A paper describes a structure:
Two different crystal forms in complex with ADP were obtained in the same crystallization conditions belonging to two different space groups, P 1 and P 21. P 1 crystals contain one molecule per asymmetric unit and diffract up to 1.36 Å resolution, while P 21 crystals contain three molecules per asymmetric unit and diffract up to 1.57 Å resolution. In both P 1 and P 21, the resulting structures correspond to monomeric FtsE and provided excellent electron density for all 230 amino acid residues of the protein. Structural comparison of the four independent FtsE structures reported here (one monomer from the P 1 crystal form and three others, M1, M2, and M3, from the P 21 crystal form associated with chain IDs A, B, and C, respectively) reveals significant differences among them. The fourth region (R4, residues 101 to 115) affects the C-terminal part of α3, which is even partially unfolded in monomer 1, resulting in a longer coil loop that protrudes from the monomer structure. Morphing between the two most structurally different FtsE monomers (monomer from P 1 and monomer 1 from P 21) illustrates the kind of movements observed between lobes I and II of FtsE. The distance and the angle between the two lobes fluctuate up to ∼4 Å and 9° (considering N157 as the hinge between the two lobes), respectively, revealing an unexpected intramolecular breathing motion within the FtsE monomer. In addition, two extra ADP molecules were also found in the P 21 crystal form. They increase crystal contacts but are not located in sites with physiological relevance in other ATPases.
FtsEX is a membrane complex widely conserved across diverse bacterial genera and involved in critical processes such as recruitment of division proteins and in spatial and temporal regulation of muralytic activity during cell division or sporulation. The component FtsX is an integral membrane protein, whereas FtsE is an ATPase and is required for the transmission of a conformational signal from the cytosol through the membrane to regulate the activity of cell wall hydrolases in the periplasm. Here, we provide the first three-dimensional (3D) structure of FtsE from the notorious pathogen S. pneumoniae, and we show that it presents all the conserved structural motifs of the NBD members of the ABC transporter family. The nucleotide-binding site is located in lobe I near the interface between the two lobes and presents the nucleotide sandwiched between the Walker A and B motifs.
Author numbering: 1 to 228
The structure:
Amino acid sequence: GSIIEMRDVVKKYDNGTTALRGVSVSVQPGEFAYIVGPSGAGKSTFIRSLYREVKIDKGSLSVAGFNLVKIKKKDVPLLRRSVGVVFQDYKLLPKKTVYENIAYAMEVIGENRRNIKRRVMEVLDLVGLKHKVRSFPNELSGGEQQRIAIARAIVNNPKVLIADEPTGNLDPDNSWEIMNLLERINLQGTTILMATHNSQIVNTLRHRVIAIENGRVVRDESKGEYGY
Ligand SMILES: Nc1ncnc2c1ncn2[C@@H]1O[C@H](COP(=O)(O)OP(=O)(O)O)[C@@H](O)[C@H]1O
Ligand SMILES: Nc1ncnc2c1ncn2[C@@H]1O[C@H](COP(=O)(O)OP(=O)(O)O)[C@@H](O)[C@H]1O
């Protein structure tokens, strides 16, 4: 069974621009897929629809057992605990330590504090930065910040991780390091969809490629080339 099932999705913004014009995409647990296409094709709109940051107008969309047409605002946090999200600009909170930035994504459950700490240390070890637990984001390189943000994204052990240009603000060396981390997370079973403009990454680390142009899927292929 699918972990993401999108059918005939249409999205028109308030000013009238139709950003998705009938997109259908099916993703199985454990897949790694790149989302590629020219500026304005609708990649960001597609990614945002997967964690309900944008609401679809027509079609259907299910993610991790959540019906994103039906889900109420009050339940989006629950969805966010099954879908981790990674951003091009990392979006750490600059006044919080590394520990606080990661712990913030874990829901408080009565006590929870000691359990939260063990899990924060687990994901820090997964990304190789346990020695930064008390650091602030400014003390970290861009690559280190994105590794911390990825630790935050997986802190609830989600089955899906969505990334919008996760290496777009990183230089080449750090871009490859972040790809290695994402691939390691994927090999453990997590489904990963990531939008990207990095032709060298897509052409080298071959995965499923979903190409969008003018709001429609034009190509969907195993181990595909970047094609742009
Ligand atoms: N015409 C547009 N084309 C592309 N992106 C847009 C457009 N209008 C708004 N945006 C996006 O939305 C952001 C601003 O959101 P906006 O609709 O102005 O809401 P608000 O001002 O209430 O926060 C922009 O930074 C951009 O990312
Ligand atoms: N908030 C917005 N309001 C109006 N138009 C928008 C908004 N955000 C994006 N668009 C437009 O919708 C289309 C798709 O944008 P986007 O999903 O960001 O594409 P991509 O990520 O492929 O560059 C573009 O024409 C863009 O200008």
